Each structure stands twice: as C-alpha cells, then as structure tokens.
C-alpha cells in the first residue's frame, strides 16, 4: 500500500491521473519524482521548468554543479540528484526530443531507467515540448517499465485522450 490517491489502473503497474505533477509530488512527497529532462539538466520549461521553478531553482543549481563535474547526460540516460522540497530523489531523464530531431526509439532506452526504482511518480516521456504522440509515450511506457509507476498528465483533454484510446 501506497500513498498515491485518484489514479485509473492501466495494467498491473501502470497507474494515471490528471494532475500536475509539482502539485502532486508536493502532497504525496514520493521516493522518486521524474524530471523530463534535457542532457544538459537546463531546467528552462515544461515539466522540468516547473519542477525546478518548484524548488525556489535549487534544482538548476544542483544540477550545474552535476554537468560542472559529469559533463551531459546521453539521449535515453538518466542521472538520480535531489528531490528537494518535491520528493526524496530525483531521477532526471531524457527522452529524445523530436523537436531536436532525436530517434524515437531512445524513447524505449529513456524508460528503461524508471525499471532501476521500485516506484515513481513521472510525466509522460518526451511528451509535451518534447514533441513525441503521447499516445505513443504511454504504449512504450506500458511495454517497457515493470516497476510502479504513477502517471500524471497535466492537460485533461490529453488525459481523456489518453484513457479513452488505451489498449
Ligand atoms: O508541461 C507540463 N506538462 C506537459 C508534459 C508532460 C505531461 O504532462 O505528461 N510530460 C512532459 C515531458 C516533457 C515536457 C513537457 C511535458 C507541465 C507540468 C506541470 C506543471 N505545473 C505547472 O504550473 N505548469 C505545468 C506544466
């Protein structure tokens, strides 16, 4: 038993809720929240915009320090830094941003890293700015995370879209 409330079951460890994610990590305070982060960690908008912004920027000071000494992060990769205010930890990952031109199927390599944490709250992968089908992101989520992962999407439309259209 867990403390994540109002979520639609999708399958045996996948879970989704209309909700913003800051909100959400601020009331449940999860050992992990999901950054959709960029390979730089420059935190400048979407959900990492917010997450950060969340955490008063400490967030982006941590993670300049984290490329100062590591240097990027891969398309796909994923680093574990600070929850902050917002959880116990962190995990940053990138998914490929088709915005940037980036294979989609480092979408599939990007949600591998959620399988390394027992249970999540995370956005959608690539989803949003990123420019992916979110539809697409929530299959590939689905057939690759075996871990508990609890979805927030903030935009109902897309929720409804999401529910509505799962197979
Ligand atoms: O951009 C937001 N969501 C879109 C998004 C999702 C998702 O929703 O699944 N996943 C992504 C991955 C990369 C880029 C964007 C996204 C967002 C989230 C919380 C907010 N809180 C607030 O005040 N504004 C907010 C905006």
């Given at each position: 038993?867990?403390?994540?409330?109002?979520?639609?079951?999708?399958?045996?460890?996948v879970?989704?809720?209309?909700?913003?994610?800051?909100?959400?990590?601020?009331?449940v305070?999860?050992?992990?929240?999901?950054?959709?982060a960029?390979?730089?960690?420059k935190?400048?908008?979407?959900?990492?915009?917010?997450?950060?912004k969340?955490?008063?920027?400490?967030?982006?000071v941590?993670?300049?320090?984290?490329?100062?000494?590591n240097?990027?992060?891969?398309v796909?990769?994923?680093?574990?830094?600070?929850?902050?205010?917002?959880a116990?930890?962190?995990?940053?990952?990138?998914?490929?941003?088709?915005?940037?031109?980036?294979?989609i199927?480092?979408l599939?390599?990007?949600?591998?890293?959620?399988?390394q944490?027992?249970?999540l709250?995370?956005?959608?992968?690539?989803?949003?700015?990123?420019?992916?089908?979110?539809?697409?992101?929530?299959?590939?989520?689905?057939?690759?995370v075996?871990?508990?992962?609890?979805?927030?999407?903030?935009?109902k439309?897309?929720?409804?879209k999401?529910?509505?259209?799962?197979?």
């Open positions: 038993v867990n403390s994540f409330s109002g979520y639609l079951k999708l399958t045996d460890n879970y989704i809720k209309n909700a913003d994610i800051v909100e959400e990590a601020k009331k305070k999860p050992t992990v929240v999901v950054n959709a960029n390979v730089y960690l935190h400048g908008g979407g959900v990492a915009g917010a997450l950060n969340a955490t008063n920027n400490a967030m982006q941590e993670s300049d320090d984290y490329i100062a000494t240097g990027p992060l891969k796909g990769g994923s680093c574990v830094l600070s929850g902050h205010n917002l116990k930890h962190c995990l940053h990952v990138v998914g490929p941003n088709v915005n940037k031109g980036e294979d199927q480092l599939k390599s990007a949600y591998e890293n959620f399988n944490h027992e249970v709250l995370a956005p959608l992968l690539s989803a949003g700015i990123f420019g992916a089908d979110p539809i697409h992101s929530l299959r590939v989520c689905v057939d690759t075996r871990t508990n992962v609890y979805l927030a999407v903030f935009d439309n897309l929720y409804d999401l529910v509505s259209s799962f197979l």
